[PDB]
Amino acid sequence: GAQVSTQKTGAHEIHYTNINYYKDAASNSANRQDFTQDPGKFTEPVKDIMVKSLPALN
Amino acid sequence: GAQVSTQKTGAHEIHYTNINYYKDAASNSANRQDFTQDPGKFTEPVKDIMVKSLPALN
Amino acid sequence: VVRVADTMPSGPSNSESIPALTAAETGHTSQVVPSDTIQTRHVRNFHVRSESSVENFLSRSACVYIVEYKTRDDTPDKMYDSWVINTRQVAQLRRKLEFFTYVRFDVEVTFVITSVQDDSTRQNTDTPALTHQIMYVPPGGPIPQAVDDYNWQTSTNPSVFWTEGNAPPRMSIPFMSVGNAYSNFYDGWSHFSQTGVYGFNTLNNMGKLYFRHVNDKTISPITSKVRIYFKPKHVKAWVPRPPRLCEYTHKDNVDFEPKGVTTSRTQLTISNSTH
Amino acid sequence: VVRVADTMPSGPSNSESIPALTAAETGHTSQVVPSDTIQTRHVRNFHVRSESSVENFLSRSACVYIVEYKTRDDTPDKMYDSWVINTRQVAQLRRKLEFFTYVRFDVEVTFVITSVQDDSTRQNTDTPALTHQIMYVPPGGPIPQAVDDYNWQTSTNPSVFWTEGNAPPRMSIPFMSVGNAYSNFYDGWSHFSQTGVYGFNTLNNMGKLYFRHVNDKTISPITSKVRIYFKPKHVKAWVPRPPRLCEYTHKDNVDFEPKGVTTSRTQLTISNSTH
Amino acid sequence: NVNSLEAYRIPVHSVTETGAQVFGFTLQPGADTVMERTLLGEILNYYANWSGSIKLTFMYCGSAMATGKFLLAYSPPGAGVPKNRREAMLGTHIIWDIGLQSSCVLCVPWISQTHYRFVSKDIYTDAGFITCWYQTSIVVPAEVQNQSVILCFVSACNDFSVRLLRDSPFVRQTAFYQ
Amino acid sequence: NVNSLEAYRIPVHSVTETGAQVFGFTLQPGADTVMERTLLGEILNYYANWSGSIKLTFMYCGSAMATGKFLLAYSPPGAGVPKNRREAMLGTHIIWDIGLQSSCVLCVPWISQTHYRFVSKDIYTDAGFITCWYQTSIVVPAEVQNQSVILCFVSACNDFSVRLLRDSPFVRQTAFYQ
Amino acid sequence: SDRVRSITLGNSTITTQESANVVVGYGVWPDYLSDEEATAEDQPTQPDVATCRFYTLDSVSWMKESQGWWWKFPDALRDMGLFGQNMQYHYLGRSGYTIHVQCNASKFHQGCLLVVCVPEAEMGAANINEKINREHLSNGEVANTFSGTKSSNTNDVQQAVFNAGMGVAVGNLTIFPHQWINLRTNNCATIVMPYINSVPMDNMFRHYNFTLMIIPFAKLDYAAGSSTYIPITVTVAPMCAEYNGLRLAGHQ
Amino acid sequence: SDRVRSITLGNSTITTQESANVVVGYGVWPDYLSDEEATAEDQPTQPDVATCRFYTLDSVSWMKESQGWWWKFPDALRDMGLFGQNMQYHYLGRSGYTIHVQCNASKFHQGCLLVVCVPEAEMGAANINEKINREHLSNGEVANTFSGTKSSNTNDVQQAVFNAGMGVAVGNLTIFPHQWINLRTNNCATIVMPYINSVPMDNMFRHYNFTLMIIPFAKLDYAAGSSTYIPITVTVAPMCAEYNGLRLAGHQ
Ligand SMILES: CCCCCCCCCCCCC/C=C/[C@H](O)[C@H](N)CO
Numbered sequence A, B: 001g002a003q004v005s006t007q008k009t010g011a012h013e014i015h016y017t018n019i020n021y022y023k024d025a026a027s028n029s030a031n032r033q034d035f036t037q038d039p040g041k042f043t044e045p046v047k048d049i050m051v052k053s054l055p056a057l058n
Numbered sequence C, D: 001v002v003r004v005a006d007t008m009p010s011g012p013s014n015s016e017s018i019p020a021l022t023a024a025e026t027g028h029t030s031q032v033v034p035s036d037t038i039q040t041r042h043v044r045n046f047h048v049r050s051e052s053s054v055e056n057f058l059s060r061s062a063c064v065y066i067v068e069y070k071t072r073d074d075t076p077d078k079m080y081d082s083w084v085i086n087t088r089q090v091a092q093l094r095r096k097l098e099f100f101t102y103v104r105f106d107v108e109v110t111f112v113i114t115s116v117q118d119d120s121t122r123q124n125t126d127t128p129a130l131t132h133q134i135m136y137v138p139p140g141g142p143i144p145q146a147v148d149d150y151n152w153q154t155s156t157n158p159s160v161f162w163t164e165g166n167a168p169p170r171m172s173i174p175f176m177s178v179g180n181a182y183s184n185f186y187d188g189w190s191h192f193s194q195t196g197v198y199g200f201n202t203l204n205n206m207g208k209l210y211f212r213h214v215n216d217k218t219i220s221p222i223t224s225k226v227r228i229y230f231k232p233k234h235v236k237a238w239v240p241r242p243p244r245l246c247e248y249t250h251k252d253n254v255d256f257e258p259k260g261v262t263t264s265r266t267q268l269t270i271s272n273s274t275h
Numbered sequence E, F: 001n002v003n004s005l006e007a008y009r010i011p012v013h014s015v016t017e018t019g020a021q022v023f024g025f026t027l028q029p030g031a032d033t034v035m036e037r038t039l040l041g042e043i044l045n046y047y048a049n050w051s052g053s054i055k056l057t058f059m060y061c062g063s064a065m066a067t068g069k070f071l072l073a074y075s076p077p078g079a080g081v082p083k084n085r086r087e088a089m090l091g092t093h094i095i096w097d098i099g100l101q102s103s104c105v106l107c108v109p110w111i112s113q114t115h116y117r118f119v120s121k122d123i124y125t126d127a128g129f130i131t132c133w134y135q136t137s138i139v140v141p142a143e144v145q146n147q148s149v150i151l152c153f154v155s156a157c158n159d160f161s162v163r164l165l166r167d168s169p170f171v172r173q174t175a176f177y178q
Numbered sequence G, H: 001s002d003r004v005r006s007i008t009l010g011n012s013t014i015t016t017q018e019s020a021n022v023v024v025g026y027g028v029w030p031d032y033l034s035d036e037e038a039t040a041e042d043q044p045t046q047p048d049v050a051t052c053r054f055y056t057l058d059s060v061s062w063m064k065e066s067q068g069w070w071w072k073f074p075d076a077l078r079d080m081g082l083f084g085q086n087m088q089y090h091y092l093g094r095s096g097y098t099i100h101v102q103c104n105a106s107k108f109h110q111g112c113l114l115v116v117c118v119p120e121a122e123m124g125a126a127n128i129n130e131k132i133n134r135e136h137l138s139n140g141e142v143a144n145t146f147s148g149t150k151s152s153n154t155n156d157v158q159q160a161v162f163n164a165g166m167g168v169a170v171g172n173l174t175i176f177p178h179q180w181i182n183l184r185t186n187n188c189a190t191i192v193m194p195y196i197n198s199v200p201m202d203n204m205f206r207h208y209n210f211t212l213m214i215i216p217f218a219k220l221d222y223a224a225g226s227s228t229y230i231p232i233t234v235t236v237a238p239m240c241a242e243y244n245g246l247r248l249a250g251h252q
């Protein structure tokens, strides 16, 4: 019941092993490898989006 | 001799590993994942069952 | 993964169907869903009857008795202590077990041992680590009558040794009844002529524990107090019964004083007044 | 593996395209890249927004309160100590949590227990290892009122025992809110007539901890001081808000004194002078 | 009346005009003193959060020749207590006619802000008021007793739940049981 | 001016000759007192290294009948501060005309020796000077107010980063919050 | 048997055990207004749970010498929750109804009620060239009472049971949708009543759509030991209620 | 051009000619509550024409020395028609909103407003260990006013513009859904705001969902002959409003 995933290494130059030992999901370690984002709801939060080259309020 | 089963997680959003280590069944952990029930012997404990829409003692 | 039942939608109705009219005189609990009386919407319900099962309700460690014994005394009976094994001297674990009439479970026993230096004139000592011995005697075995008695050898009896400062000692115990379930209540006598004792005191017969300090006579008195924690696991339970209203009195009978059924209101109809 | 965006090369331009002219009056943040105004080269950028995520920012253990209690006293209330559970008495963990309005996280709790022998006449003793008990009471449970009270049995309440000299005790705690997220701020009242208390003090309701020495009355006073470390893990966070400028005053309200917006310059234009 | 069996009997009889209140309590299975010591109140008093619907069944224990009608109203909170039959018929209610089928069921719907209430009392999770009113009086013939008795029942529906273990507030011992 | 809302208003008006300096600060998001308490300054004050470009947006809050021009210059360090408009137009700059589109963007390019700067102040990683100058004056017609207000904005680009956690230098408590 | 009937409209349920049947109007069940019969042009308001539910009126006591009672019904529900509020904020209303009347006795009591639902019951006056005040035609949920003889009060309806306040024979009053509450067989009387008017929608204050009438032909009678207080309880539920022309609250 | 915008919600229409754009929340448009996120079990009430329409609040006058204004918004619409009545008769409410703010000038006036829509704006007090009365956090459709300096009234909010009553930097207050009313380009500011709360439905008296704030950064200024009185008018329309748990009228 083991899982292999890559480590945090640098660029231009791994595979640790994790096994969960407790019956609850609240005992698991922190999920410190989710690097995704979406700033489309804080920047650009408008209706009728703008095209960055047009005067846009033309 | 390992067994993989799911953890207790919430809804709308696992797989721990267990190995038994002792020769007796009295050393095993608690069976805290049996969620089944049957209240047909406490509620509805009668002969000639009732159909919930008929007067039933009609 | 077993969910609770969803709520199905309903509309207006006018017919000879009567889900609300029933008769509880047949000992039958009505299966009326809220979508039978009023107009309800569709609710996808994700609740799980998980932490209400008989396994999750009883499998908690509970203090059942406090055992006190010393390390040097004038009288030899205060240097060891014993306890006839029952679950009926603390009202919490007893009242949790008395939901059912018959039970079947494995036991997980954990001892918590703490030591306190007694008050004396020569408290300034340098005492090495105390080691305690907890010997279980199955029903019928020989009984030690001193701390230096030769019945403490544990040639056949189970025992456990704990040095001070470690984790608490823990062992598991299988189902030990001579019948098919631990009878929580026994309505009957001990003798066939219906005399003797009345109650569950006939069917207890579980053995008894013994506690002493493995060390010899020290030069300062120290009071040890060990607490027994039972954990019922691998649980099966049969034929439920109502919980107890009244406060308990003794361990061997079920006797009581009459208590009122509930707390009084002093009125019978609510209002928007001082209620 | 998610990189940041590369810089694309550009050349000279002369046209009616105007990336630099925009209007921030629509609440819109301009998406101007440096390759839209000046001539830039091609840069393969290998930076990772890794240690800026909401998981990596909050998942650090933080001291939330200091709890002090003794082992022998004249008054019995100074032999145990209690704490109503909140994260709003240390300004660092509070100000880190108040970036967001609603949060959802599992908690990892670690206790650090240290003992100091108090000043007395009889300091020359030989004290065995102290054992501490940390009992958590869910909201509504019975409250112990002495160190020898019979509510310390932990038949249902969670507890932890630590012998002196080991590693710190650690346990995990799931998401315990009755709503869908821990409301960091609650703009509202407690009563439906809009009276009572104003603020997040209505929605706290998390229970309270209890601390005592398992050992009995010792012959010398020792002051124990246990520190609680919270670690928020498995984090989700919603609807951000600006950080606090002003210094806090209390735990139950949000009130303040007005503080200046920033530090003064005493001039408005830079120069090559004493700046 | 708690030190007898009279605590279960709801007194009901023929009235003078109409429209009086019969009984009343607050929907707190585990904190209200009416349904505190009931089986639902015991099992909910070993828990801290609860959720789901509640059935209330009323059995009429009068004579076979007597008739009557009642209004079994549920009122979610936010207002106060309904003070007459006009304010009570604005909520979840049912008119019950006494005939051959001797018992009615008021199935209290789950109407809540959150998913779970609290078993102990707090201002935030308040649940409402169960009240009962005279629709029409008890008309009885000659040589039949006028005052009769209603019995009341409670149970949980098939969508009911409990979440958090705790110790019961009822267990109170001081010494051991030697 | 920090104990009011006047700290946000950049005063600007019609000049006598030309070519004077409007405002100025140093590019230190997290150590400079101008952009210390800004949102970029807060989030960068929970970090110790930073990298990437910075947008500066300027909104003109004057009248619809007024015109004007400005020079928004960036100067990497190594020299001092540009002391006139002639020394300022030798760096990264932009001429902004005030018209219908009411706001301009000065996108400060990432020009550095290393990959990351420091958020706190040191001599080794110095970043430069943001300065603003009058290209042409503010010409306004009759019966219109002369003195107007520029507002300023800051944010990060899509290539921005932070690396090292530390505690903020702003949190200062002495006792607990009873 | 078919004597048990159950009705659920919203969050209110009526279970009876000695019912008889259900009269449904003139055969028509209440439905919404179609686009072919519609006159106004804007979107109506259809609450359908907060409105379509049973409202319980006042209970009235039936002595041996009682003569009758009446209620006007778009007006007796003036102060009954969101039906009354939606009446006060809109200009055009349109609904059907369901009238359920409770009255119980034992097998030793006798008597017989007549529950009539009379459309456009334009009533007479006590004095012939006199104006009737609005507090006597209707009073909300409080019932007005017929009299056994020729009543000659000021500004009041002519209250005589043998003319029903309308000038007809009270025995001929069974042409309307009616039931009987006979105390040896019945316990209740359910009347489903659709919308009957000359226009598709109408204002619910200026108009009285219909009038419920409960008149005892066989007088109430009992022996020297039976129960004296016998109430009569009326419960009403609007059906297919919709509303048009939203404006401020009032009626003037 | 895209500067002309028209909005129709019910029987009310807003046509503007110098609009800018429309900020829609955090990208989410207001919609009804699904059956997966639902908690209560009974049928909700969806009026959708008598409720979802524009309500016009009080106009406030903007001098040269004005500092700001705020309105609490499930509470400023307490006495606005059937939205307020449906608030008073139900227990659980859930709605989104559309906030449109009018302010006009000429091409000779200057100034700049900031229209912020702040969720959970739990405000401070003037005296630190003191309780705030409810008449100062909210007053219905009548606006409360910020002050330029440290206000120290009794039972009142700390009214200082450079802390917005909440203890933060007012320049950092642009993280919320906001627009500007710049008097050389704008005329109005439309903000569509979905439902943001920790629970799926909540009571609309005990809770304040959000707080509109209008703060002038660039002060209003004009010459010696231009018009002095410049109003600011706020108009709000609930969206996707539904209601649960009908009971009697009141709030206590
Ligand atoms: C020293 C190692 C062995 C430890 C022995 C200690 C406990 C021995 C007995 C095991 C537990 C039995 C306790 C009683 C079980 C039932 O609850 C009772 N019969 C009443 O229900």
Ligand SMILES: CCCCCCCCCCCCC/C=C/[C@H](O)[C@H](N)CO
Pocket (backbone or CB within 6 Å): D085, D086, D087, D097, D107, D109, D134, D135, D136, D158, D159, D160, D171, D173, D182, D183, D184, D204, D206, D207, D209
């Ligand atoms: C003895 C074993 C159990 C230990 C119990 C200690 C902590 C119990 C509460 C768990 C942590 C909850 C702390 C509060 C969480 C949120 O941050 C607050 N509601 C405010 O956001």
